[PDB]
Amino acid sequence: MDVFLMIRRHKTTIFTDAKESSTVFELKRIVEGILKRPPDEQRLYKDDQLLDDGKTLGECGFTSQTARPQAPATVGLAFRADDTFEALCIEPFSSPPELPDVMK
Amino acid sequence: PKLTKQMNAIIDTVINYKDSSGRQLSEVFIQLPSRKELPEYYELIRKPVDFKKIKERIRNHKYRSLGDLEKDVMLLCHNAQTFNLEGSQIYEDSIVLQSVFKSARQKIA
């Protein structure tokens, strides 16, 4: 069936949705729409594992079970700058503040 | 002392109240269901009270404050609002006796 994902990179966060069936490059064409950046200048990551471009989403962990719309999977993205690539970086989301004393 | 005569005359009104179409409303709440008969009820109603369990405390001598009874009576209405649903007359009956009670208390002060 489907997969819903958060392509997180620094302060950026791209919420798209592919197919259980689809592969790595296929997502990069989506990014090559949002940012309009070419796939070779794109290094797709998951856990820190540099995927493929022709490896099925279901295989690499992305199922209908773990990529829920209200619980989307984080897919980090590294970028090419002068042949040499950059380090994968995502600045985390702001910590949910203190819990009220009537809520505790 | 005199309190126990007030408290009786206060609750007696409600107990003796026959509605707009001639029929006692309170009749239901007088005696709470039997334990093994309606267990389902008791779990949710973690504090059960029946009109006979108030009449008891008056007769015996418990509420040594006239307000002390209002606090208890409101509980019977809360338990009844708790279990029972908005619509069912059991729920729409607690409200009556709840407004009516404070009107029999408006009688004293």
């Binding site: 949705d17 719309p69 209200q70 619980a71 809520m103 | -």
Partner: protein, 87 residues
């Protein structure tokens, strides 16, 4: 498939599908691209996007609908966000 940039009180960029992002009653007025907030942090904004994702995907569909999860502390933070962005 168009996308819009939602930005918070911590510069956090949020590219979400223009159709998914139009589910908001408040955002819709400012469209019919670059939307900015200040009362809204990032942790709430990602959850609001996650609600946006969800809504379209499980609205109208007769298939069984899953449980929407709210983290206890984000719940009020989100309660005034759902008030503002008008769900």
């Amino acid at each position: 498939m168009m996308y819009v940039k939602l930005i918070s009180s911590d510069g956090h960029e949020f590219i979400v599908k223009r159709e998914h992002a139009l589910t908001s009653g408040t955002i819709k007025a400012m469209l019919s691209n670059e939307v900015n907030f200040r009362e809204i942090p990032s942790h709430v904004l990602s959850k609001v996007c996650m609600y946006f994702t969800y809504k379209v995907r499980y609205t109208n569909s007769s298939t069984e609908i899953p449980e929407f999860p709210i983290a206890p502390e984000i719940a009020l933070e989100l309660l005034m966000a759902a008030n503002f962005l008008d769900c």
